[PDB]
Each structure stands twice: as C-alpha cells, then as structure tokens.
C-alpha cells in the first residue's frame, strides 16, 4: 500500500494499546505504565484550566490531549531509523495548523 497510510494506522494502534494494555480491567491502585498517562492527564488538565480556564476548558481538554498525543507518538515513530514520517510530512502538520 502507501507507507504514509500504513503509519497512520500504526499511530492509531499504539494509542489504542496505551489505554487497554496498560492495566487490567481497572485496578484502583494503578499499574506502572498507566502512571505516566495519569501525570500527563493531570498536567494538561491543570494547564488548560490554567490557560483558557473558562468552564469550557474541559470541553477542549480532550482536544488538547489528542493534539498532545498525536505529536507525542508521531515523534517516536519517526525516530525509528528505517521509518517514514507522518509529521515530517509537513503538509499534514502545517495543514492541521491552518485548520485549527
């Protein structure tokens, strides 16, 4: 197929595993991988409550979280040596910036 199309699929599959294979069936105590995405959740919760800080800050809290995670995963995938970027295909990132 198309390398770009295949890697958009890889980003989706990485993100799906991070909120499935990271803890079993919800254990309150917490599992070591999920501790990371707790801290990320909180520092962007308390950051965008710090920024826009309306009552619709939390309405843009998922949006600011998936703008984080998209860039966060796509700058680990492109860091693999034999790998073809998504983000360093500028046309998607710059276009996305213009959309926002």
């Amino acid at each position: 197929l198309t390398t770009f199309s295949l890697y958009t699929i890889i980003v989706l599959l990485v993100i799906t595993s991070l909120y499935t294979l990271t803890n079993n069936n919800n254990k309150i105590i917490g599992s070591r991988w999920l501790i990371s995405q707790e801290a990320i959740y909180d520092t962007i919760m308390n950051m965008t409550k710090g920024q826009i800080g309306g009552k619709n800050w939390g309405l843009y809290f998922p949006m600011i979280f998936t703008l984080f995670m998209f860039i966060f995963i796509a700058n680990l995938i492109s860091m693999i040596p034999y790998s073809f970027a998504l983000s360093a295909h500028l046309v998607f990132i710059i276009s996305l910036s213009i959309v926002i």
């Binding site: 390398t3 890889i10 990485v14 595993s17 294979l21 990271t22 803890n23 079993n24 069936n25 254990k27 599992s31 070591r32 991988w33 995938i77 693999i80 040596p81 034999y82 790998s83 073809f84």
Partner: protein, 85 residues
C-alpha cells in the same frame, strides 16, 4: 414529688450520632464488594494476555516492550527497502 421521664425516651441520639451516615454507607459498601478481592475474574489466555501480565500489568516497568515495539518498526522499513529494491 416529681419523677420525670426523659432518658428512656431517647431515639434522637440513636440517629443523632454522626457515624450513622457512615454506617449505612459501609454496610452497603462491604455487602457486595469482594471478600478480600480474590479478583472478579483471573482467567485469561490469548497468548498476549501473558504479554500483558508480564509487562502491561504491574510486574515490569522494564524497557522490554519499548524494545519489542521499536524492533517491529525497524523490521518494517528495513524489509520495505527490499520491497522497493
């Protein structure tokens, strides 16, 4: 001369005490919760439930899954060089 009758007409101290609220909470909180948490289900197997148990359930915060996931992408484009070759 008068013998009055208040201490035996008490039932407002028997609701008045604060832990009553906690009581009616935690007889409900502990009558349906697991006895000691022996798990609600502990059987699994799909040959990646073992992968999850060792890595993505508390056991290893060790870097082995990172390596495993990394190695997949190294294998992907390296083979694809030879797919473009």
């Amino acid at each position: 001369v008068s013998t009055l009758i208040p201490p035996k007409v008490v039932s407002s101290k028997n609701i008045g005490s604060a832990p009553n609220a906690k009581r009616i909470a935690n007889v409900v909180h502990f009558y349906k919760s697991l006895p000691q948490g022996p798990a609600p289900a502990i059987k699994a197997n799909t040959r990646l439930a073992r992968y999850k148990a060792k890595y993505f359930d508390g056991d290893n915060a060790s870097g082995k899954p990172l390596w495993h996931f990394a190695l997949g992408i190294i294998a992907f484009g390296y083979s694809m060089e030879y797919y473009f070759h």
